């Protein structure tokens, strides 16, 4: 097969970055490690929110962090916890301006990371994968999508024989640059191994 990451393939035109800060040497290395440890720490105790993105911006001790979520149900009104020390526990190895925002991803059926994550949950629920793929695609296609494509590969339904389940409706042109194609991926942990879920969501451009 061999195909390039549809995110990296854009980056410049279509699909901007995810960590937008500028530094020269002697700083880039340290600030990138911290940046990645933020992404690592957030992903853990915020998965129940199901986060589509983790945007990060900086400006000398400013560190802004925008968490996109389908349902920000785990924020609960100011002093109702789930934010207070939670956005303050970041500065236990940072000590800088931990400005943590929360975004409301409107339609989760149009967010590739969320789609793949919903599918990967279902694999671990011991669902029928082929039927799960079909539904998720139509579900994405039901919410106004111009094209969709989900891919689960390896060890399907347990059973000693790595497979690859494939389904895709509408239009998904990966080669085109003016594409606006959202890509998501998820690890499904099973008692019989590990399988990967790709999810492609496409909308118009020009």
């Amino acid at each position: 097969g061999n195909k390039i990451h549809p995110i990296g393939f854009r980056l410049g035109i279509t699909r901007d970055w995810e960590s937008r800060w500028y530094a020269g040497k002697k700083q880039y290395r340290h600030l990138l490690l911290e940046d990645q440890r933020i992404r690592g720490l957030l992903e853990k105790e915020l998965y129940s929110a199901g986060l589509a993105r983790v945007d990060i911006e900086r400006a000398a001790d400013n560190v802004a962090v925008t968490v996109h979520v389908a349902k920000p149900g785990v924020v609960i009104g100011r002093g109702g916890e789930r934010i207070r020390v939670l956005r303050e526990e970041l500065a236990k190895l940072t000590g800088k301006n931990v400005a943590l925002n929360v975004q409301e991803v409107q339609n989760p059926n149009l967010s590739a990371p969320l789609v793949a994550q919903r599918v990967a949950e279902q694999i671990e629920r011991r669902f029928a994968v082929r039927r799960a793929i079909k539904q998720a695609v139509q579900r994405v296609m039901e919410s106004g999508a111009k094209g969709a494509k989900v891919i689960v590969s390896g060890r399907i339904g347990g059973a000693e024989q790595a497979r690859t389940e494939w389904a895709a409706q509408g239009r998904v042109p990966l080669h085109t640059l003016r594409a606006n194609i959202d890509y998501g991926f998820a690890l499904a942990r099973t008692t019989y191994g590990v399988l990967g879920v790709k999810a492609y969501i496409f909308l118009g451009e020009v």
Partner: protein, 60 residues
């Protein structure tokens, strides 16, 4: 020898020449770029992710 080996890579005492680079995301000792502090493998992963500020595909 992998866990106790990514220990030494950060421990760095006893003679200055015994200290060496080591990917942080992984534990790779080879092809470790000083600029990112990452191996060539990890660097490619994150560059496609978009989590590498400014880092962009090279076409010319």
């Amino acid at each position: 020898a992998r866990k106790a080996l990514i220990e030494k890579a950060k421990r760095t005492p006893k003679f200055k020449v015994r200290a060496y680079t080591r990917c942080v995301r992984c534990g790779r000792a080879r092809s470790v770029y000083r600029f990112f502090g990452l191996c060539r493998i990890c660097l490619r992963e994150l560059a496609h992710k978009g989590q590498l500020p400014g880092v962009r595909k090279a076409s010319w």
